Structure formats: C-alpha cells, structure tokens
C-alpha cells in the first residue's frame with residue numbers, strides 16, 4: 001500500500017531503523033581471499049520480518065526518499081567500520097548525486113572520517129549513472145578525500161568502457177546475467193572476453209556478480225576475472 | 241500536419257512514386273574501392289521534390305505502411321540491378337518480418353531472382369531486430385535463396401555478440417555515434433577496438449557508418465575496420 005509503505009519508510013528513515021547486512025566479495029583464484037564486504041540495507045518492519053533492499057528501494061525512489069537512506073547508511077557504515085580492519089563497499093544513489101546539498105553533505109561526512117578512506121569503496125549501479133561529467137568530479141572529489149569509486153551491474157553500457165579509464169575506479173562489477181550458467185552456454189563467453197580484455201587494458205579489475213554455481217565460478221576464474229560474489233558464498237548476513 | 245502525410249504516403253505508395261538513391265560503401269584502406277552501394281528511398285512529393293527516408297519513415301510506421309515501402313523498394317531494386325554489375329544493400333523493416341504474408345511475398349520475390357542473390361544484401365537496423373528465433377528463421381530462408389543478411393546501426397546490443405556467429409551475416413555496420421569525432425573524443429576507441437576484436441574472432445567484417453571527417457576515417461582505418469560510408473565520400477545520389 002502506498003501509505004503502508006509510506007508510514008513505514010518515513011518512520012524507518014527517521015528512527016534510523018535500518019540494519020546492516022553483508023555479503024563477502026572474494027578473489028576468483030582464491031575464494032578464501034576476501035576483497036571486501038558489500039554492505040546491504042535491511043528494513044525492520046514492526047510486524048516482524050527483515051525486508052531486503054530489493055523490496056523497499058522501489059518505494060524509497062517513488063517517494064524521493066532515497067537520499068535520506070544514503071545519508072543514514074553512510075553514517076552507519078562509517079561508524080561500524082571503527083570496529084574492524086575489513087574493507088567495505090556501499091552504494092550511492094542517483095538521488096544523492098542529483099542534489100548538490102545531499103552530495104556536499106556526503107563529502108562533509110567523508111572528510112570527517114578521512115581515516116577510513118582506504119577501506120570504503122562507493123558504488124553506483126549502471127541503471128543510475130549520472131553524466132560522465134558528474135562521474136568525473138565525483139572521482140576527483142573522492143580521490144582527494146582518499147576514497148575510491150566503483151561501478152556495478154555493468155554493462156548494458158559497454159560503449160562507455162573507454163570513458164572509465166579516466167576515472168580510476170577500484171573495480172567493475174559485472175551484472176550476473178552476463179555470467180548466468182556461462183559454463184552451460186559458452187555462447188556468453190565472447191562478450192565477457194571483450195569486457196575482460198578491454199578492462200584489463202586500462203588496469204581495471206573485474207568482479208563477477210551473483211555467482212550461483214561452481215560451473216559459473218570455474219569459467220569466470222578461467223576467463224581470468226579478478227573477483228566473484230553470490231549465493232555460492234552464502235546469503236547476506238549480519239556482521240561476522 | 242499529421243493529415244497531409246497520411247495522404248501523401250498512401251498516394252505515393254499507391255503510385256509507386258519513389259526514387260532510388262544510392263550512397264557508396266567503400267574500403268577503409270582504399271576509399272576508391274567500392275564494397276557496395278546502399279539503396280536509399282526518396283519520396284517524390286507533388287512538385288517532384290525529394291523527401292529523404294529519414295523524414296518520412298517515422299510516418300510509415302505511425303500509419304503502419306512500412307511493409308508497403310519494403311515490397312515496392314525490393315521490386316524496384318531487383319529490377320534496376322539488371323542494368324549493371326554492382327553490389328547493392330537494402331533494408332527490410334521489422335513490420336515485414338512480423339507480417340508472415342508480406343514476408344512470404346518477399347521470399348517469392350527473391351526466389352524469382354535467384355541470379356541476383358550474390359549481389360544483394362538485406363539489412364536490418366539494430367533498432368528493429370526481431371527476436372533471435374526470427375533472425376535465424378530469416379537467415380536460413382535467404383541463405384537457401386542465395387541472398388545474404390546484415391545488421392546496421394549496431395553497437396547498442398554488443399552483449400548479443402555471442403549470438404551472431406551462428407548467423408553468418410555478411411557484415412556489421414557500426415552505428416555512426418560510436419565513430420563521431422573519434423579523433424577528438426578518444427574515449428570512443430576502446431569500445432570500437434573491442435567490437436573489432438570479437439568481430440575478428442567470428443570473421444565478421446565491420447563497416448563504420450556516417451563517417452564525416454578525415455580524422456574519423458584515419459582512426460577507423462588504423463583500428464582495422466574493413467569499410468566506411470558517409471558524407472566524407474559524398475551525398476546520396478540517383479544512380480547515374
């Protein structure tokens with residue numbers, strides 16, 4: 001319900017009733033080498049359950065509240081990294097990117113935790129990339145404050161591969177759809193080889209998303225990709 | 241006015257009141273060597289003035305008349321090829337592939353001109369690709385009749401690069417935007433290079449569309465592309 005979701009999300013944003021979940025992202029050659037943990041937002045509904053980002057993000061956007069989540073989540077993430085030595089990754093939404101106020105606030109916050117710059121990567125989903133202009137300032141600002149930037153769910157937008165060279169990303173997360181059952185339909189290899197060849201040529205490591213299978217894993221590994229992540233390595237779970 | 245166009249096209253379509261224009265498609269490494277000529281449709285209006293396909297095609301679509309153009313153009317093109325020995329290229333519209341009747345008529349026509357098979361390439365623009373099934377049903381069909389198929393305005397669907405080898409297409413015409421001012425905007429090279437790497441591996445020659453500039457030509461040529469077309473080599477003109 002537009003107003004069930006509306007009361008719930010507004011209250012949740014205000015009391016900061018969001019939980020941090022994590023999923024390990026690991027080296028392809030060694031699934032015991034942890035590259036970072038990808039932070040996932042979980043919503044606490046009063047009638048019990050933990051609700052996944054996938055279920056609530058759609059409404060956050062419909063209400064234009066996404067930037068609030070972003071702020072909340074970044075403050076929480078930075079806070080919680082004080083407890084360990086692990087590298088983390090977290091999304092930024094197009095909404096934050098579009099509001100100069102929100103975006104400044106974010107830089108404000110990063111400047112306050114400059115110590116953590118080398119342990120937190122910020123991520124944008126392909127489906128909400130801003131202009132290459134915006135991406136360029138974004139990385140300049142971030143690099144100055146010691147933080148790295150990455151892109152994810154790539155790439156329907158593969159034609160921008162060369163634009164990315166000038167951005168010095170930490171890595172590129174490939175949409176899992178491009179590796180789904182790859183071991184089973186070698187059809188999909190040509191495209192992956194292309195990304196892998198191009199990206200390697202500008203020193204940008206590739207991470208394969210949503211790997212569900214040993215078969216999928218063994219081909220990704222073999223084609224020479226750097227990282228993997230997915231249900232093969234477990235459900236997203238609270239800090240451990 | 242939407243009204244004026246309805247009557248013009250229906251009338252001109254009925255009267256077969258169209259002119260074939262041509263634009264040469266030429267080797268990247270020798271712009272004097274003509275790979276083939278692309279047939280361009282030109283509407284004659286009431287005063288004998290020509291209207292380019294670019295302007296009138298959107299209306300054939302709205303009025304659902306593209307299959308009419310297709311049949312009329314195909315017949316004329318097959319007719320005029322009898323007067324020379326040059327190779328030609330001609331678009332089929334999605335509307336035809338989707339109309340089983342129109343499509344069989346197209347096959348009946350082709351079948352009636354087996355002898356021209358090796359000199360006529362049919363083209364589908366990327367914007368109007370049918371589903372993979374239709375593409376392959378179409379490829380086996382033309383093949384048995386001697387005719388070959390190609391794709392144009394390509395680049396946005398590079399992720400389908402793996403599905404292309406089983407088609408034995410004649411060539412891939414790369415959409416001009418991936419080429420535009422490539423000599424200034426060198427961001428564009430990595431994508432092109434990637435397309436050319438995959439195209440080499442499936443033995444599918446590339447042709448760059450709408451090349452306007454010696455700088456573009458020079459870059460395209462250096463990257464190994466087979467062919468080029470565009471205003472650099474002159475405007476579209478009647479056979480003469």
Ligand SMILES: Nc1nc2c(ncn2[C@@H]2O[C@@H]3COP(=O)(O)O[C@H]4[C@@H](O)[C@H](n5cnc6c(=O)[nH]c(N)nc65)O[C@@H]4COP(=O)(O)O[C@H]3[C@H]2O)c(=O)[nH]1
Pocket residue numbers: 023038039040041052053054055057069070073091092093125152209210211212229230231232236
């Ligand atoms: N089919 C399949 N799915 C898998 C597999 N492995 C993990 N997943 C799921 O797909 C999403 C993966 O995380 P993500 O790539 O960061 O994708 C994320 C991320 O891009 C975004 N998101 C999550 N948290 C935040 C946040 O705090 N802020 C922003 N702006 N976006 C967020 O929404 C997505 C999260 O949705 P989730 O519901 O948490 O769902 C997660 C996860 O539950 C797999 O092997 N197969």
Ligand SMILES: Nc1nc2c(ncn2[C@@H]2O[C@@H]3COP(=O)(O)O[C@H]4[C@@H](O)[C@H](n5cnc6c(=O)[nH]c(N)nc65)O[C@@H]4COP(=O)(O)O[C@H]3[C@H]2O)c(=O)[nH]1
Pocket residue numbers: 263278279280281292293294295297309310313331332333365392449450451452469470471472476
């Ligand atoms: N800016 C720029 N433009 C250039 C350049 N070189 C050529 N052009 C123009 O772009 C189009 C090129 O032909 P096309 O790629 O086959 O693209 C064609 C073709 O796909 C299609 N078309 C034309 N005739 C037919 C037809 O008889 N049947 C069907 N189904 N489609 C047709 O519509 C397009 C033709 O529209 P046109 O008005 O003829 O416009 C032509 C041409 O005038 C350049 O260097 N720069």
